[PDB]
Paper text:
The eukaryotic chaperonin TRiC/CCT assists the folding of about 10% of cytosolic proteins through an ATP-driven conformational cycle, and the essential cytoskeleton protein tubulin is the obligate substrate of TRiC. TRiC is the most complex chaperone system identified to date. It has a double-ring structure, and each ring consists of eight paralogous subunits (denoted as CCT1–CCT8) arranged in a specific order. Each TRiC subunit consists of three domains: the substrate-recognition apical domain (A domain) and the ATP-binding equatorial domain (E domain) linked by the intermediate domain (I domain). Here, we present an ensemble of cryo-EM structures of endogenous human TRiC throughout its ATPase cycle, with three of them revealing endogenously engaged tubulin in different folding stages.
Strikingly, in the closed-state TRiC-tubulin-S3 structure resolved to 3.1-Å resolution, we captured a near-natively folded tubulin and determined atomic details of the interaction between tubulin and TRiC. Importantly, inspection of our TRiC-tubulin-S3 map revealed a well-resolved tubulin density in one chamber of TRiC, hanging underneath the TRiC dome predominantly attached to the CCT6 hemisphere subunits (including CCT1/3/6/822,29). The tubulin density appeared to resemble the conformation of native tubulin, and hence we defined the captured tubulin as being in the near-natively folded state. Overall, the N and C domains of tubulin were relatively well resolved with atomic details observed. While the majority of the I domain of tubulin was captured, a small portion facing the central chamber was less well resolved, implying an intrinsically dynamic nature for this region. Inspection of the S3 map showed that tubulin engaged with TRiC mainly through its N/C domains, forming intimate salt-bridge- and H-bond-mediated contacts with all three domains of the CCT6 hemisphere subunits. The tubulin I domain also loosely interacted with CCT2 hemisphere subunits through association with the A-domain protrusion loop and C-termini of CCT7/5/2/4. Intriguingly, we observed the N-terminus of CCT8’ from the trans ring adopting a bent conformation and extending all the way to the cis-ring to associate with the tubulin N domain, in addition to being involved in the inter-ring allosteric network by linking the CCT6/6’ N-termini and CCT3 stem loop together. Notably, in the closed S3 state, we also resolved a portion of the C-terminal extension for most TRiC subunits (except CCT4), and captured the uncharacterized direct interactions between these C-terminal extensions of TRiC and tubulin. These C-terminal extensions, mostly hydrophilic, appeared stretched out from the surrounding subunits towards the center of the TRiC chamber to form physical contacts with tubulin, and hence appeared like a net holding and stabilizing tubulin within the TRiC chamber, which may facilitate folding of tubulin.
Numbering used by the authors:
A (entry chain M): 50 to 441
B (entry chain N): 249 to 347
C (entry chain e): 78 to 538
D (entry chain O): 234 to 388
E (entry chain L): 7 to 529
F (entry chain a): 254 to 354
The structure:
């Protein structure tokens, strides 16, 4: 009952208490946790359909659930299962030749052909009433990051999806810049035009080494040489940053020592520099490809060539669940994009995230094989009539 | 003990006896600062060591040891004194005359 | 390996353990003999004889069995070319185990493993020099006597040469690292000139520990502790293979097999403390990743290693226990070069000596000595029961032939080898093996006959 | 004809007084401390050497360094000896147990005739024999069970 | 010992239930994996009671017995027997389990015949010696004329993969198994063939990569592809070294000297990378992790940096590129660099892998297994591992025998010819040894559904007068020549099936008393 | 410390550095001091003597609403181009009446 545009979704409540609504066949079978050993192989069948194709995953259980159901009368007629496995391969090799004759060779330059392919996968989901906005945004999020007519592969890890609670599905955005969920400290500015963004992996704090370091104080004036020399150390780091010409700093999240101290925060606020902390180490690949920055580790190599560029780097104060960052425009943009997904409940956003991934995977299949067939039960009838004549 | 990580490395013989004398001279420094105004009653909220009682004994000073914080704010209005937290920063306006 | 909570049967466990610790061949026969002396004492107990009077009668009867066992005893072992009495002695011990498929191959392994490590001037054999290792795979016929040592090779570099033709082995006990003291240091660094002195200290230390091995002419290193990553590539540049993380007594066997000395530091290395070895290589066994060491050639080594292979771990752990009994009977021949003839031939001959001295004189202990002679016949009649024969039919024929003429080495066998002469069938056992079988079983019977009360508790809790 | 050196000292490299903090300032003096720790242990082994004491007995353990030093100089040692056995060993050879190795002489070392390590009962035993001025003895019991030898010891 | 039992919680049996529990527990092991023997045998699916059950379908007899956990004492000998067979030759673990169980089933028939069990051991030792000469005299050697040896290697991989899940993939997976060992050109290390399992696609979409695949993609701001590069790998620490002096601190008097030390620490880390790029390289592989400070130095110089591949990942790169590990950088004239053509990144199953295309001296391979489910990929990995281990020993021992039931009838004929030249005490035990050798083509014939009572009777009549290469044809269901059809197995595989089953049946038949101790925490 | 004569100069320095900041933020005309951290009993003496109001342990959300509405600058430490203690006294807030009712 969860197949086709007239199908209904299923809600699986786990033992922890995180009940989610899902319509994709791969996400349903991973949450049901079937105890039968033969039914767990059908869970991994829909998992590999999500990896290879992405949009085949309720239908692979209807076929494999019916191919074994057709073997009920075959095993009660004295047919050995090795004979059924030999004949199912001959029907499989003849089945691809029928689907290839129904295929029409298309080109990725036609936006109207790619639009009807992405709208088909959204008709079965909850966003079928939002196909006037999400299906145009699914094509533009792919065809701008693939660099077409030059490669037959596309990585979906370059398309980040940000889930924020608030508003409706019509409030989704296709901002091509960087969207961060971290807060701005200090948040006294939160907007800078013609911004130059720099990624800093150095810790702007007190000097300390990997080896054990201690300070020996054995004099009256030696306590004055500890605090005033630590202020002059980080002042040489802020003035090295300020003389470069950047206005937005992205500090990587440090675990061993403190990345940005309270003394370093006060000098960066007086230089009118927006500082953003807690950038993860696994997210620095997406930042350097989008804005065009370079990861700066040591402060002696922090030059103007390793900076980025942004026409507008502001913190959009949202009315819903807090606020986020949004960089608008950058010189020489990379092959990355960010999709902001909204929703009235926390359950609709998890379904809208899986429906967008089911829409981006449809255009992913058109990059690997530039051929498409008719849908809505069309090739299943032709596979049923041509293989019946082949069996005679 | 101060609010630090103070640790002394004692190498010579005269260093250990000097530290125990500097602890006695530090109490005599603050006891000499509170007798420049010539008081009669010293009232504090924390402990008073026996070395601090020795300088106040020969100066004829009656010392009360562990008066509460709420009772010190009440006697500051009755006698007209000011609760100071530094013996070397005492002034003539901080002495509660008129009691 | 039993869970017997019975204090009488616990003394039978320590009886078989005492035979294994002293001689190590008749651990099975010393329990059947002790149970035979107690079974014959059961009918003597019903006749009214005191249990100490039976125990005093067994001491006067076992003394005849010791003196009669020293009648025919001779060996011609010279450990040069007359190894034929040594092989046939080990075949009697290995004939009862599961190594009868390698009855001639594995018997010659245990003979040559003892004579290469034994001190003939003191008649002392040390079993710490005989390393018994086992690895699954191959067959029982692939068990070879490796003159040298077999350790788990742990070449830190995967591009190390796996075959050394002439190895000048440099045995050391210092890890390839900068020298760390045994006390608390907390070394202080003050300026940047001291931190640059830290880099040049370790860079020259790894070049000093590598050059001091190459100046001695060594081409192989053994180290007890671990290696550093910086010291691993310096081994490949200087063509110096080295193993890592060898055990405690494992490197003690390398310095004896190669004639080298174990050096504590790197500064005490010299050409005189190096070991000499021939084919040094690692051998991979099938699909595993063990790569044990094989030492083919040596020069007057006093340490050998037996590499037992098999089809499963059940046949290897038994062969480690079977061949250890074969290594013990060669050790007993160096302690005492007198032998007897097994197969029940010595028990029937000793049973006739007690019966002849039971009438000289039958005053009080006549019934106690005849119960000793009837219990000595249980061991040869148990061999007739396990061989499918009849016990009382076969024992009456063998015992009567030793009285009608002078008593030969006359026993029994399984396939019987034609005649029943143990001298022709080469069934040779040690004298002190059967001398301790009668001595330990008599004293264990005396401690379980001289007890008239049991004070065991009830439940556990 | 060996000589026995009864000791109460540790022959290990890690002999530490548990309160020493060797603060070093440079790398030239850092190597001098590590060379001094080997020179402390090797100076104790030179005191046992050059005195005829071929047999070494100590109630404190001996590490891998002093074990290999005596093997190269053809000397025997035995560490972790119980204190009840060293008191009997002192009255057997007629020597004295020296905690400090600096006062070793001919008047503190022992003297015997036959010293071998046999294989009685599987386990090894280092027995001393031949000393005529023996104020003690040792009665080795051999039996077939642990409870058998305990009754033999009680008898 | 049952009468007046002196045990606490332990039980035992002597000659009544000892051989009864030994024959029940060993036949039920052999009858379990009886249905998995042959080219038409089915497979098993192994499952647990719960708590991350991790279902693992296997057809190989070693992986079935190592996970069931049999409580029978005598059945653990046959479980450990198949474990050594997988570790030594990697094949015949199912064949050695049925053969060791059919010997004890024929030994159970000698219970009522009142045969002494030591006579059966002495009768089987002479039967095993006659069976060794049947395989040794029928072994076919291959020295020169390498175009017949490569054809002989495809018959070995075609016979091993026919009894596994890769049934109708012998046109592809035979070439993936023969050419993988043929590219080794040396010792069978069995670790240079790194098998990567990726979901998505059929088994026909699997292939053997001409280069090498890896993970842990190239840095952040580093180039993704360099043509005609010099590969240098490493096993050294990059950042946060704490270099080998335990008990060394930085004891200064002011905080300005701490800024001079941490700048001197980064200068020595910069000087270490400057010693690496003096070799003139374009790619860098470190076994340890590479932090951010040396990663910026490789990105500024246009050099790749592959951080934390694997402990055994630098060993396969050293065998596929022709370099060395080179953990110390102080002599550029003594460090041999690798060679490659393309270091482009490929995408297999929505995962970017580093493809080392066009490498020189490539003594390492990468099999990209693609399957429908994870259960197929776990079965095809063990099926390929059972095929690569035989070809790694066929190049070391080129002797091959004719399989498919032909080798078992040659061994059973040599025992039956010497069973008639023996007296009647041991001749009955030798006839039971020859009947168990004929059971191994009977299990193969009956698993397909053929008439096993007549096909083995036609094999026994053929081998009795000539026909040394006559075997069982499982394609049509008749008797054909094994040299024409090309069904051969290795000599060392068929010897270890005969020898280990004869030694394991010797142990269980010699057991007359099973004294099991009281277990712990079982009440 | 390696000399006992330098003991009391370090112990007095822990309060002299503390009282150095409290005298340069108070001599510029500041009467109401709000602090989100903590003012101990030793620092409360300098406000009673000078006649100033010192409020301690206020919320971080309440300090931003006061400093934005009164024109004050939320200062955390010392700043302004390698100065010892400057405090930027022209950036003080203003109020008509601060009365505790
Ligand atoms: N507009 C439409 N008209 C008719 N059928 C449709 C339409 N849109 C989608 N479908 C059908 O709905 C089905 C949805 O399948 P789906 O669950 O997405 O497969 P998978 O789980 O593999 O992604 C398709 O097989 C398609 O035939
Ligand atoms: N070829 C043979 N002929 C006759 N008897 C033999 C033969 N080989 C071994 N035996 C007998 O088998 C017995 C095995 O004793 P065993 O169990 O090995 O004693 P232990 O347990 O002390 O090792 C020996 O006492 C010996 O007399
Ligand atoms: N093409 C074939 N024709 C005839 N017999 C075959 C063929 N392929 C495989 N076999 C038989 O199937 C058996 C499979 O044994 P297998 O289960 O692989 O043993 P193991 O588990 O020890 O590897 C082999 O003994 C072989 O004789
Ligand atoms: Mg869909
Ligand atoms: Mg024996
Ligand atoms: Mg096989």
């Amino acid at each position: 009952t969860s197949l086709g545009p007239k199908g209904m979704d299923k809600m699986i409540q786990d033992g922890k208490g995180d009940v989610t609504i899902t319509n994709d066949g791969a996400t349903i079978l991973k949450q049901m946790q079937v105890l039968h050993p033969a039914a767990r192989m059908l869970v991994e069948l829909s998992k590999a359909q999500d990896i290879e194709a992405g949009d085949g995953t309720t239908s692979v259980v209807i076929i494999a659930g019916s191919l074994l159901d057709s073997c009920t009368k075959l095993l009660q007629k004295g047919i050995h299962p090795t004979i059924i496995s030999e004949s199912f391969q001959k029907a499989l090799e003849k089945g691809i030749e029928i689907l290839t004759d129904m295929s029409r060779p298309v080109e990725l330059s036609d936006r109207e052909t790619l639009l009807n392919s992405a709208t088909t996968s959204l008709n079965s989901k909850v966003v079928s009433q939002y196909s006037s906005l999400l299906s145009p945004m699914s094509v533009n999020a792919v065809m701008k990051v693939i660099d077409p007519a030059t490669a037959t592969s596309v990585d979906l890890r370059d398309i980040k999806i940000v889930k924020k609670l608030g508003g409706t599905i019509d409030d989704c955005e296709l901002v091509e810049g960087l969207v961060l969920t971290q807060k701005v400290s200090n948040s006294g500015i939160t907007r800078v035009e013609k911004a130059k963004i720099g990624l800093i992996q150095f810790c702007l704090s007190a000097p300390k080494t990997d080896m054990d370091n201690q300070i020996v104080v054995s004099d009256y004036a030696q306590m004055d040489r500890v605090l005033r020399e630590e202020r002059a150390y980080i002042l040489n780091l802020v003035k090295q940053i300020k003389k470069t010409g950047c206005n937005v700093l992205l500090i990587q999240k440090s675990i061993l020592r403190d990345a940005l101290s309270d003394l370093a925060l006060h000098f960066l606020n007086k230089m009118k520099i927006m500082v953003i902390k807690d950038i993860e180490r696994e997210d620095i690949e997406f930042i350097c490809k989008t804005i065009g920055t370079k990861p700066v580790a040591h402060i002696d190599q922090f030059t103007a060539d390793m900076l980025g560029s942004a026409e507008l780097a502001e913190e959009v104060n949202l009315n819903g669940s807090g606020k986020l960052l949004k960089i608008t425009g950058c010189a020489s943009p990379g092959k990355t994009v960010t999709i902001v997904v909204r929703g009235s409940n926390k359950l609709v956003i998890e379904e809208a995230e899986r429906s967008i991934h089911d829409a981006l995977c449809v255009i992913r299949c058109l990059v690997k094989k530039r051929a498409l067939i008719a849908g809505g039960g069309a090739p299943e009838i032709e596979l049923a009539l041509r293989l019946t004549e082949y069996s005679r | 003990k101060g609010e630090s990580q103070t640790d002394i490395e004692i190498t010579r013989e005269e260093d250990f006896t000097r530290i125990l004398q500097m602890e006695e001279e530090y109490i005599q420094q603050l006891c000499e600062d509170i007798i420049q105004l010539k008081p009669d009653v010293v009232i504090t909220e924390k402990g008073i060591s026996d070395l601090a009682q020795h300088y106040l004994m020969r100066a004829n000073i009656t010392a009360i040891r562990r008066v509460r914080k709420t009772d010190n704010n009440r006697i500051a209005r009755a006698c007209g004194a000011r609760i100071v937290s530094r013996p070397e920063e005492l002034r003539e306006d901080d002495v509660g005359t008129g009691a | 390996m039993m869970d017997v909570d019975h204090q009488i049967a616990k003394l039978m466990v320590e009886l078989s353990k005492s035979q294994d610790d002293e001689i190590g061949d008749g651990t099975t026969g010393v329990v059947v003999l002790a149970g035979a002396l107690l079974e014959e004492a059961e009918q003597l107990l019903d006749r009214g004889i005191h249990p100490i009077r039976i125990a005093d009668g067994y001491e006067q009867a076992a003394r005849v069995a010791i003196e009669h066992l020293d009648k025919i005893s001779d060996s011609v072992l010279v450990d040069i070319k007359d190894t034929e009495p040594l092989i046939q002695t080990a075949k009697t011990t290995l004939g009862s185990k599961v190594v009868n498929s390698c009855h001639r191959q594995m018997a010659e392994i245990a003979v040559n493993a003892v004579l290469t490590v034994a001190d003939m001037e003191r008649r002392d054999v040390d079993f710490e020099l005989i390393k018994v290792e086992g690895k699954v795979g191959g067959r029982l016929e692939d068990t070879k006597l490796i003159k040298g040592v077999i350790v788990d090779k742990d070449f830190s570099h995967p591009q190390m040469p796996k075959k050394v033709e002439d190895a000048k082995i440099a045995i050391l006990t210092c890890p390839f690292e900068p020298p760390k003291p045994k006390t608390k240091h907390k070394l202080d660094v003050t300026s940047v000139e001291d931190y640059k002195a830290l880099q040049k200290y370790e860079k020259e230390k790894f070049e000093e520990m590598i050059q001091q091995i190459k100046e001695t002419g060594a081409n192989l290193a053994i180290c007890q502790w671990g290696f550093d990553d910086e010291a691993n590539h310096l081994l490949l540049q200087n063509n110096l293979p080295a193993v890592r993380w060898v055990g405690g007594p494992e490197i003690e066997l390398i310095a004896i097999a190669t004639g080298g000395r174990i050096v504590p530091r790197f500064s005490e290395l010299t050409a005189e403390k190096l070991g000499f070895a021939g084919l040094v290589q690692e051998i991979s066994f099938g699909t595993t990743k063990d790569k044990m060491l094989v030492i083919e050639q040596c020069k007057n080594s006093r340490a050998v290693t037996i590499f037992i292979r098999g089809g499963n771990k059940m046949i290897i752990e038994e062969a480690k226990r079977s061949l250890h009994d074969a290594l013990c009977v060669i050790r007993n021949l160096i302690r005492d070069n007198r032998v007897v003839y097994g197969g029940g031939a010595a028990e029937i001959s000793c049973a006739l000596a007690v019966s002849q001295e039971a009438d000289k004189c039958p005053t009080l202990e006549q019934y106690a000595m005849r119960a000793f002679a009837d219990a000595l016949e249980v061991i040869p009649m148990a061999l007739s029961e396990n061989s499918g024969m009849n016990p009382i039919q076969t024992m009456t024929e063998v015992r009567a032939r030793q009285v009608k003429e002078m008593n030969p080495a006359l026993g029994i066998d399984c396939l019987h080898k034609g005649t029943n002469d143990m001298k022709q069938q080469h069934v040779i056992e040690t004298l002190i093996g059967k001398k301790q079988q009668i001595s330990l079983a008599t004293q264990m019977v005396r401690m379980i006959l001289k007890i008239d009360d049991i004070r065991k508790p009830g439940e556990s809790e | 004809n060996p000589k026995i050196a009864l000791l109460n000292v540790e022959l290990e490299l890690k002999a530490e007084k548990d309160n020493a903090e060797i603060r070093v300032h440079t790398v030239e003096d850092y190597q001098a401390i590590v060379d001094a720790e080997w020179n402390i242990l090797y100076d104790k082994l030179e005191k046992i050497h050059h005195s005829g004491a071929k047999v070494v007995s100590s109630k404190l353990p001996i590490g891998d360094v002093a074990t290999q030093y005596f093997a190269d100089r053809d000397m025997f040692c035995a560490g972790r000896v119980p204190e009840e056995d060293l008191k009997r060993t002192m009255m057997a050879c007629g020597g004295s147990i020296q905690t400090s190795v600096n006062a070793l002489s001919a008047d503190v070392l022992g003297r015997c005739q036959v010293f071998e390590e046999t294989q009685i009962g599987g386990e090894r035993y280092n027995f001393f024999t031949g000393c005529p001025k023996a104020k003690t003895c040792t009665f080795i019991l051999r039996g077939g069970a642990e409870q058998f030898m305990e009754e033999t010891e009680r008898s | 010992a049952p009468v007046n039992i002196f045990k606490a919680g332990a039980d035992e049996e002597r000659a009544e239930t000892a051989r009864l529990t030994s024959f029940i527990g060993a036949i039920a092991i052999g009858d379990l994996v009886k249905s998995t023997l042959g080219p038409k045998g089915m497979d098993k699916i192994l499952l647990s009671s719960g708590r991350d059950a991790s279902l693992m379908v296997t057809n190989d007899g070693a992986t079935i017995l190592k996970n069931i956990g049999v409580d029978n004492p005598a059945a653990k000998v046959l479980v450990d027997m198949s474990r050594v067979q997988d570790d030594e030759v990697g094949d015949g673990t199912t064949s050695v389990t049925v053969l060791a169980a059919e010997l004890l089933r024929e030994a159970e028939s000698l219970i009522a015949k009142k045969i002494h069990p030591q006579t059966i051991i002495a009768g089987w030792r002479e039967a095993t010696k006659a069976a060794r000469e049947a395989l040794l005299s029928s072994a076919v050697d291959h020295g020169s004329d390498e175009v017949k040896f490569r054809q002989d290697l495809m018959n070995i991989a075609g016979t091993t993969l026919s009894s596994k899940l890769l049934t109708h993939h012998k046109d592809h997976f035979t070439k993936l198994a023969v050419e993988a060992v043929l590219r080794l050109k040396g010792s069978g290390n069995l670790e240079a063939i790194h098998i990567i399992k990726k979901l998505g696609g059929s088994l026909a979409d699997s292939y053997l990569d001409e280069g090498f695949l890896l993970d842990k993609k190239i840095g952040v701001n580093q180039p993704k592809r360099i043509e005609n590069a010099k590969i240098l790998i490493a096993n050294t620490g990059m950042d946060t070294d704490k270099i080998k002096i335990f008990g060394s601190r930085v004891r200064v008097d002011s905080t300005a000297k701490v800024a001079e030390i941490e700048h001197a620490e980064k200068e020595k880390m910069k000087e270490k990378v400057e010693r690496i790029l003096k070799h003139g390289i374009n790619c860098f592989i470190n076994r340890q992790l590479i932090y951010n400070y040396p990663e910026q130095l490789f990105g500024a110089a246009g050099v790749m940096a592959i951080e934390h591949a694997d402990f055994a990942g630098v060993e396969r790169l050293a065998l596929v590129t022709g370099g060395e590990i080179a953990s110390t950088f102080d002599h550029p004239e003594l460090v041999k660099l690798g060679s490659c053509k393309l270091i482009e990144e490929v995408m297999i199953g929505e995962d970017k892998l580093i493809h080392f295309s066009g490498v020189a001296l490539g003594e390492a391979c990468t099999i990209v297994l693609r399957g429908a489910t994870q259960q197929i990929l776990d079965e095809a990995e063990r099926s390929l591992h059972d095929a690569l281990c035989v070809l790694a020993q066929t190049v070391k021992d080129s002797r091959t025998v004719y399989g498919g039931g032909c080798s078992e009838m040659l061994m059973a004929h040599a025992v039956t010819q010497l069973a008639n030249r023996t007296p009647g005490k041991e001749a009955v035990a030798m006839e039971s040894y020859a009947k168990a050798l004929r059971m191994l083509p009977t299990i193969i014939a009956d698993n397909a559904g053929y008439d096993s009572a007549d096909l083995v009777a036609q094999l026994r009549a053929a081998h009795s007068e000539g026909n040394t290469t006559a075997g069982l044809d499982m394609r049509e269901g008749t008797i054909g020549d094994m040299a024409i059809l090309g069904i051969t197995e290795s000599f060392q595989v068929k010897r270890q099936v005969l020898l280990s089953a004869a030694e394991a049946a010797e142990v269980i038949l010699r057991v007359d008393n099973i004294i099991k101790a009281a277990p712990r925490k079982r009440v | 410390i390696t000399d006992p004569e330098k003991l009391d100069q370090i112990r007095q320095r822990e309060s002299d550095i503390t009282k150095e900041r409290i005298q340069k933020i108070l001599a510029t005309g500041a009467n109401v001091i709000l602090t989100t951290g903590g003012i101990d009993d030793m620092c409360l003496k300098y406000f009673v003597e000078a006649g100033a109001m010192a409020v301690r342990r206020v919320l971080k959300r309440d300090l931003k609403r006061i400093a934005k509405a009164s024109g004050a600058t939320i200062l955390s430490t010392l700043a302004n181009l390698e100065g010892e203690e400057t405090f930027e006294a022209a950036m003080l807030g203003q109020a008509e009446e601060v009365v505790q009712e």
